[PDB]
Structures are given as structure tokens and as C-alpha cells.
């Protein structure tokens, strides 16, 4: 089980990676909209 346990733990770390990537993209889009609004 140690093999499966450790690999699933790396998978959980990878879930955190995915969450960070998605949140970063969302924040980038929000700042995107802010600047685009500002120029006008």
C-alpha cells in the first residue's frame, strides 16, 4: 500500500498544482478586464 499511498500523495500535490494554475488564470483574466476597461 506504501507504493499506492505515496503515488496518491503525489497525485494530491498535483491537484494542488492544478488548483493553483486555474486560480492564477482567473486572476490574470480579472486584471485583463481591469486594464482593458481603464484605457477608454
Amino acid at each position: 500500500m506504501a507504493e499506492d499511498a505515496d503515488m496518491r500523495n503525489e497525485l494530491e500535490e498535483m491537484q494542488r498544482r492544478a488548483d493553483q494554475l486555474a486560480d492564477e488564470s482567473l486572476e490574470s483574466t480579472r486584471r485583463m478586464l481591469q486594464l482593458v476597461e481603464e484605457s477608454k
Binding site: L33, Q34, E37, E38
Partner: protein, 139 residues
């Protein structure tokens, strides 16, 4: 000064003086002059090539200055503008006004306040607009 400039046939400069006059008059709790000046300036600037893009903004101010008198005459006012300048419907000001009207129609102060917060978050609000929105909220 605006009278002199108009008498000199130098347009686009008297307009700024009248805009300042209307903006300051709206502060003293006298709204008729502000509404008249704002609507006149907006309709005048509608037809100009360069100034056209700014025209919409003026209307919004009048609407706010028209909201204090009574809510009924504000709703109708919006209609009068939208039919004349259909592109006004595209700007965020129309949506904000409709949402504020819907929130106020049922004493839902919280929805009005939340919409104001969201609009301010997207773009910072001016002191004039902040004060006028606070005054409207009092009702």
C-alpha cells in the same frame, strides 16, 4: 464667461463652462438646471464625429440628477434617451440604472449596495457620483 464665448461663436469652450456650471449647481440641491444643461450638451455632442463617443456619459449624469426628484420620472426618462440613442443601451450605465431601479422598487437596499460595490470595484467611482448615490440611497 460662457455668455461671452457663445457671443463670440467659439463653440466647444462655452460647453465646458456650462458643464462646470451644471455640475456645481447640482451640488446645491437644485436639479432642474443641471438636467437641462446635461441634456442640451448631450444632444449637441451626439452629432459631432469626435465627441460622439463621450455623449453617452452626459446622459447618465442627467438620469442620476433626475432620480432624486422621483423614481417614476427617472424610469420614463431612460426610455426617452434609449429610443433616441439606441447605442446607449450597450454602455454599462444603462444596466447599472436598471439594476438599481429593480433593487429600489422593493426597498432592497442590500442589492442596490452590492451592485454599487461591484461597479466601484470594476472601476473606481468619483466623489460627485459617490455623494449623489449616497443621497439617492437615503430614500
Amino acid at each position: 464667461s460662457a455668455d461671452y464665448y457663445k457671443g463670440e461663436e467659439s463653440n466647444s469652450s462655452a460647453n465646458k463652462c456650462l458643464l462646470k456650471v451644471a455640475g456645481y449647481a447640482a451640488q446645491l440641491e437644485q436639479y432642474q438646471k443641471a438636467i437641462d444643461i446635461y441634456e442640451q450638451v448631450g444632444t449637441s455632442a451626439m452629432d459631432s464625429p469626435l465627441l460622439k463617443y463621450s455623449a453617452k456619459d452626459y446622459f447618465f449624469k442627467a438620469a442620476l440628477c433626475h432620480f432624486c426628484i422621483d423614481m417614476l420620472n427617472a424610469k420614463l426618462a431612460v426610455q426617452k434617451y434609449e429610443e433616441l440613442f439606441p447605442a446607449f443601451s450597450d454602455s454599462r450605465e444603462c444596466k447599472l440604472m436598471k439594476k438599481l431601479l429593480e433593487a429600489h422598487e422593493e426597498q432592497n437596499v442590500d442589492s442596490y449596495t452590492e451592485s454599487v460595490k461591484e461597479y466601484d470595484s470594476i472601476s473606481r467611482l468619483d466623489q460627485w457620483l459617490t455623494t449623489m448615490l449616497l443621497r439617492i440611497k437615503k430614500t
